[PDB]
A = this chain, B = another copy of it.
Amino acid sequence: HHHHLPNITILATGGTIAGGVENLVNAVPQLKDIANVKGEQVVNIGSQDMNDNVWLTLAKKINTDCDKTDGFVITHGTDTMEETAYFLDLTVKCDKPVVMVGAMRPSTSMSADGPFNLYNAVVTAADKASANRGVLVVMNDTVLDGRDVTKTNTTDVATFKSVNYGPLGYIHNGKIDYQRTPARKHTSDTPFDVSKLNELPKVGIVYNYANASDLPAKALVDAGYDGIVSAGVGNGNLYKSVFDTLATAAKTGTAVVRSSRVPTGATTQDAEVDDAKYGFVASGTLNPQKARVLLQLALTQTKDPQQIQQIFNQY
């Protein structure tokens, strides 16, 4: 028995997080002890410039290249890693671990976090126990589900947290103790199939706050947007002028999801917004940016609010 190591594929979307993509193994020599790593640059953007085209590219590349590898690590900027992770959570049909990883400090800074995050992302992708848990994010010693994971602090290396349901597992000395898995349907259990798409439905986000102008919302309407996500106040409430515009849009063919600017907690049914009455959809624990991801994919399949709510209740 040759003691052989998993084949792990690193897909890079941006700059390096340790220190080019072919060189990652010399940046972090301990990688060669836990996997056989192949690197490919897919794109080279800053994740604040993340977009629908890169999401389609990643989902098709992983889906196409699933047989060629034992698992995937995606290097991504931290700003939108929580959006890409959820998109891939819903669209990846490969049944091998996909793990996203980033760094909150530059690779050339004192105590750069990139290198060890990358080690732990590879450990996670290599661990047969990581399978069947959806698309993961690995940051600061912790394995996080792609649905709940979010950036909680602007600068902290410990910023990534599953703020509503907690992490799946912690990583110590290259081993994971998993104690949870996401109940919401992901990966091969969703009907979201993007293999044949080169665009996604147009979904935009508007913010609520005292004195909020109806103009951003009206611009998305006037633009024909397929859906709008409201970053509501409190339990997904809307400023009277925004509510008026969205209530009109919902009765004239625009899908409307009520989310919350509030960083934890569900936008529920049965609070101060009669959703049945307005044709609205409640986002549950999906924050605006995540709610947008699911609304875009819900729109690839249905324009019916009652069917979108069911999708927001299951994924």
Given A78-B234, A166-B164, A267 and B208 contact (CB-CB distance below 8 Å): no
Q: Is the CB of B204 within 8 A of A154?
A: no
- The total of chain A residues at the interface (CB under 8 A) is 101
Interface residue A152 (Cβ < 8 Å from any Cβ of B): yes
Interface residue A205 (Cβ < 8 Å from any Cβ of B): yes
Given the complex, which residues of B lie within 8 Å of A223, measured CB to CB?
Answer: 213, 215
Q: Is the CB of B183 within 8 A of A183?
A: no
C-alpha spacing A47/B210, complex, angstroms: 8
Q: From residue 189 to 236 of chain A, which have CB atoms closer than 8 A to chain B?
A: 202, 204-213, 215-220, 223, 225, 231-236
Interface residue A111 (Cβ < 8 Å from any Cβ of B): yes
Q: Find the B residue at minimum CB distance from A268.
A: B172
Mark A79-120 against chain B: 1 for CB-CB distance below 8 A, else 0. Answer: 110011000000000000000000001000111111111010
Q: Nearest 3 A-B pairs (CB), nearest first?
A: A166-B166, A216-B216, A154-B265
Q: From residue 152 to 178 of chain A, which have CB atoms closer than 8 A to chain B?
A: 152-159, 162, 164-167, 170, 172-173, 177-178
What's the nearest-Cβ distance from chain B to residue A214, in Å? 9
13 chain-A/chain-B pairs, Cβ below 8 angstroms: A50-B239, A80-B210, A111-B116, A151-B262, A152-B263, A153-B262, A154-B262, A159-B265, A179-B184, A209-B288, A213-B219, A216-B217, A261-B288
What's the nearest-Cβ distance from chain B to residue A53, in Å? 9
Given A140-B158, A151-B262, A260-B154, A215 and B204 contact (CB-CB distance below 8 Å): yes
